[PDB]
Amino acid sequence: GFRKMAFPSGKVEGCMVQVTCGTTTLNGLWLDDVVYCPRHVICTSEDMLNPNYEDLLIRKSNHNFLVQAGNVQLRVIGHSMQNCVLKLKVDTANPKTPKYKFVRIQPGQTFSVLACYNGSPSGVYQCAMRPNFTIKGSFLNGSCGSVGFNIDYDCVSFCYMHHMELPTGVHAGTDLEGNFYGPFVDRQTAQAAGTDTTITVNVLAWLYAAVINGDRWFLNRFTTTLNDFNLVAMKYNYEPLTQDHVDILGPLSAQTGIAVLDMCASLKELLQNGMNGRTILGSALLEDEFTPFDVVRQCSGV
Amino acid sequence: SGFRKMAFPSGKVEGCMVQVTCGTTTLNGLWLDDVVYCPRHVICTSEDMLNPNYEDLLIRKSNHNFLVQAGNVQLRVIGHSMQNCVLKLKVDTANPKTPKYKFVRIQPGQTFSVLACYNGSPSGVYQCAMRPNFTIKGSFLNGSCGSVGFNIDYDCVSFCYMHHMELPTGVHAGTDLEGNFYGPFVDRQTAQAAGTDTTITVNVLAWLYAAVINGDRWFLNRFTTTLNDFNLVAMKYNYEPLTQDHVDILGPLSAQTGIAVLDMCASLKELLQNGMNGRTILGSALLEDEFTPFDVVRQCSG
């Protein structure tokens, strides 16, 4: 079976805390003796319309921040702002800190989101960073500071911290250095994303997955150049491939014996001729939120 | 806003998973207090699995034939019994990470989270529903037996599923934590078919309400139906009947959207006898039936 699968969330659950300033409360990430959270925690609701964060933060001291792990307060002993993230040094090193790294992901890459409220994990689900740098998440009031992550061996790579829901109902946030993905700002104002596109490298990974499972009617006898493929794909609102995309498809190419550019020629035929009422892996829709790594991970184990 | 298939955070269950080996057979166990629960076919050789007499095989085993590993630590087995299709190994150490828990038997159409594990190590988490034919559509590979399904309510884990088998059709079968299979299956290495599956109608209606809450409305109509006339059409299409209890449980979603349950039933009836005409609902080309009304209310409250 093929399912959207999240990483086991326990290593991240052990890092979630609550951060409050005044009556504004959201989630933070407690790693070693530092808590990371969205800087708009320092705003009242009226502040968020047009905030001057530097001005607002110079008014705050360590003793204005309430950090709680459950009902246990963690005393704040220093604070600083890095882009759109606040870092609060606390006096206790988190004994559940996993091995971790901060990463900035590419569009197309997937990650698990641990949706949290008041520092308490509520649910986990899988997301892809869209080409327009939004994610199609599920978030309610109080969810900011929830994080997205991948887990490789035993190391947690944090890649996303949640800040905002756009008018269209999709979501926007930052990496853990506080830099937004996309052309968004943490202000209570209506912001639009670019028109989205289909994640071509993931569609190719899905076609490879179909082949591995014996579903291969769409393989044609042609090949293409990468440049010709990119120029055609863009007319169908598909993303162009990069050299890194070609490389990450390498393992599936080797597993199936189907050259990357041959699969591109097959996809191109699918694009210009349609599916003709046929299905691939049970579906009439091409799936674009499974990466090549997701295909390998779900068809091969951990 | 937003709507996503979401699992419970898995940390509380991750702290309970161990590896269980007997001879050349290895799978996963669930370690609660001083007892480890795992599928009994771990006592089988590849020859025994074809037609096993489990009581015979078990009486010929001693405690030392069982190797239980929690991470890098071997747990000493000091007792063993069998409860239906589940083996219970008594160990000399209590699991410090045992959560508050209970064993429950889930009803068809209810959902739960699965923590897929290999060699005692958590690999991924996803949401499943118990199908009306008592299969589940999971994602499981070799080495995954003993993985468990669960729900979390406040701080209590309700374990409802332990994994044993993949049917020839690719769906999955297992037991509750008393070792009783869901459905007419047996833990023998033979090809087994399920009863004809039906669609979980109350869940489809819940998901249609979710679609309206998120702005997807093209499928609505001004028609209404009686409950009985709806059920005549549902049964014609191999949908489960909708009961008055189901109507009542959908009440909160009906109030939140202003759409009477029987008006949504008229919409569903039109979809069943007309199709979607290549359109999508919440990004799906098929009618989704693995969200309960509770799943939708929890995710879409407000």
Side-chain angles (χ1 to χ4, degrees), chain A residues 1-152 154-220 222-292 294-302, chain B residues 1-222 224-302:
Chain A
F2 251 129
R3 305 225 29 181
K4 283 177 84 122
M5 181 168 308
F7 287 99
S9 57
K11 291 173 159 54
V12 182
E13 288 167 61
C15 298
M16 295 313 303
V17 296
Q18 199 181 180
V19 184
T20 299
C21 198
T23 62
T24 308
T25 294
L26 40 63
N27 307 284
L29 184 70
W30 179 24
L31 297 168
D32 292 320
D33 64 342
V34 178
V35 172
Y36 306 79
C37 75
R39 64 179 181 173
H40 69 255
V41 71
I42 69 183
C43 297
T44 67
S45 57
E46 192 66 20
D47 286 344
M48 295 172 193
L49 296 184
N50 186 21
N52 187 311
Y53 283 105
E54 290 82 5
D55 222 306
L56 289 173
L57 185 58
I58 213 184
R59 305 209 299 235
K60 299 301 182 189
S61 26
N62 292 328
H63 65 76
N64 299 129
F65 294 92
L66 177 59
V67 175
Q68 301 166 294
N71 272 9
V72 180
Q73 172 176 16
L74 301 180
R75 180 174 58 107
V76 174
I77 66 182
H79 66 277
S80 62
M81 184 169 65
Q82 180 182 11
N83 300 308
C84 301
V85 157
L86 180 68
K87 293 183 287 190
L88 307 172
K89 194 130 157 229
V90 294
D91 71 355
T92 305
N94 182 0
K96 301 183 206 273
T97 306
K99 297 185 268 50
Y100 72 94
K101 153 199 314 143
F102 290 172
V103 307
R104 189 173 175 77
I105 55 167
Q106 285 299 100
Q109 292 200 256
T110 56
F111 53 97
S112 296
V113 168
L114 180 70
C116 295
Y117 299 89
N118 305 301
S120 287
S122 173
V124 65
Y125 58 88
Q126 198 77 354
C127 274
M129 180 63 68
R130 301 305 305 179
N132 69 1
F133 298 109
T134 63
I135 63 174
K136 303 177 156 259
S138 179
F139 290 116
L140 306 168
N141 188 63
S143 61
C144 282
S146 300
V147 297
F149 61 100
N150 283 277
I151 303 180
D152 298 293
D154 43 18
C155 177
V156 178
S157 288
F158 295 99
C159 59
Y160 179 83
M161 181 167 278
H162 180 52
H163 294 241
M164 172 166 48
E165 179 166 301
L166 294 196
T168 58
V170 305
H171 298 102
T174 67
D175 60 21
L176 267 291
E177 304 186 308
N179 293 125
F180 263 85
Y181 291 101
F184 305 114
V185 293
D186 46 352
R187 177 189 331 173
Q188 190 68 352
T189 201
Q191 303 166 53
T195 58
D196 199 22
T197 52
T198 303
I199 301 157
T200 309
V201 64
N202 290 358
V203 174
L204 292 170
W206 180 254
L207 297 180
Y208 275 109
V211 176
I212 291 166
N213 281 77
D215 202 0
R216 42 174 198 267
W217 61 264
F218 49 85
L219 297 178
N220 69 18
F222 286 138
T223 201
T224 178
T225 64
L226 195 58
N227 180 245
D228 174 88
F229 174 80
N230 280 354
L231 296 175
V232 177
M234 287 184 310
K235 304 186 195 125
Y236 291 85
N237 270 291
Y238 272 57
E239 283 294 300
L241 295 159
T242 66
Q243 187 57 37
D244 286 355
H245 289 155
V246 175
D247 299 333
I248 60 172
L249 286 162
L252 293 165
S253 188
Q255 186 179 345
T256 62
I258 297 168
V260 168
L261 287 175
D262 294 359
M263 192 66 90
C264 290
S266 295
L267 175 57
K268 184 216 281 185
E269 208 202 291
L270 285 182
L271 289 187
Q272 32 208 28
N273 296 144
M275 302 276 264
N276 303 345
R278 306 215 49 173
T279 68
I280 297 177
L281 284 169
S283 159
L285 303 193
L286 298 177
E287 168 73 40
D288 81 339
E289 297 209 350
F290 285 99
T291 69
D294 297 330
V295 173
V296 168
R297 137 169 200 251
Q298 198 177 136
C299 302
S300 293
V302 245
Chain B
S1 254
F3 198 73
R4 273 270 192 203
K5 193 83 70 92
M6 206 179 288
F8 285 106
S10 58
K12 291 178 167 66
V13 179
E14 293 172 52
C16 299
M17 300 310 303
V18 303
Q19 181 184 253
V20 180
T21 292
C22 189
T24 68
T25 304
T26 296
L27 43 65
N28 309 282
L30 184 76
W31 176 30
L32 303 168
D33 298 317
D34 61 338
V35 177
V36 175
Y37 305 75
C38 71
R40 67 179 178 176
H41 65 260
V42 69
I43 67 176
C44 294
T45 76
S46 80
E47 184 191 14
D48 297 335
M49 278 172 197
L50 295 190
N51 201 352
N53 191 314
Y54 281 108
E55 288 298 357
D56 270 40
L57 297 174
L58 182 52
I59 186 141
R60 301 170 179 162
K61 292 275 151 51
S62 165
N63 288 342
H64 78 260
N65 296 129
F66 297 102
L67 168 60
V68 176
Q69 299 166 245
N72 82 313
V73 166
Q74 294 189 0
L75 304 180
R76 184 178 55 115
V77 174
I78 63 173
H80 67 267
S81 56
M82 188 168 64
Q83 177 175 15
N84 301 308
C85 303
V86 162
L87 181 65
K88 300 192 274 196
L89 303 178
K90 181 183 184 65
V91 294
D92 62 354
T93 325
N95 185 7
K97 303 178 196 212
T98 312
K100 315 215 94 67
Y101 76 97
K102 50 178 84 68
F103 292 171
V104 306
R105 193 171 171 91
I106 205 168
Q107 296 285 265
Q110 293 184 310
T111 53
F112 55 97
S113 297
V114 168
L115 180 68
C117 298
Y118 299 88
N119 299 105
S121 291
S123 175
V125 70
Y126 51 88
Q127 196 80 345
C128 278
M130 179 56 66
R131 311 289 318 155
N133 71 355
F134 288 104
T135 65
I136 71 172
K137 300 172 188 180
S139 177
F140 291 116
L141 302 173
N142 260 335
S144 63
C145 287
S147 296
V148 298
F150 60 97
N151 285 286
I152 305 183
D153 299 278
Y154 303 103
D155 60 350
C156 185
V157 181
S158 295
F159 291 106
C160 61
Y161 180 83
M162 185 173 268
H163 182 49
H164 294 243
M165 169 162 64
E166 182 171 305
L167 302 188
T169 58
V171 306
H172 297 98
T175 65
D176 63 26
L177 268 293
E178 292 187 300
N180 287 310
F181 264 92
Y182 294 98
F185 309 110
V186 294
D187 47 341
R188 72 193 211 254
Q189 184 76 345
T190 65
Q192 301 168 52
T196 59
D197 203 15
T198 50
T199 302
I200 303 156
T201 308
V202 63
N203 290 1
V204 177
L205 294 167
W207 176 76
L208 292 177
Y209 278 108
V212 170
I213 293 176
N214 282 274
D216 245 336
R217 302 177 59 99
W218 65 264
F219 49 84
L220 296 182
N221 60 45
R222 70 176 186 88
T224 200
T225 181
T226 68
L227 179 60
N228 182 75
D229 293 335
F230 172 72
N231 278 330
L232 288 171
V233 175
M235 292 184 44
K236 183 185 181 187
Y237 287 91
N238 258 327
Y239 272 53
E240 293 285 305
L242 196 72
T243 70
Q244 186 58 48
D245 293 355
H246 294 151
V247 175
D248 294 334
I249 290 151
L250 288 165
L253 299 171
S254 185
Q256 179 175 358
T257 56
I259 300 171
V261 175
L262 291 176
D263 282 355
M264 195 62 85
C265 289
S267 292
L268 180 49
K269 186 196 292 180
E270 176 169 50
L271 287 163
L272 290 183
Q273 41 203 30
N274 293 356
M276 282 151 80
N277 323 306
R279 305 198 65 163
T280 63
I281 300 172
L282 284 175
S284 176
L286 306 174
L287 303 172
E288 166 75 43
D289 73 338
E290 300 204 352
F291 291 94
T292 69
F294 162 94
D295 299 341
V296 176
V297 163
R298 176 171 199 268
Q299 197 168 147
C300 297
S301 54

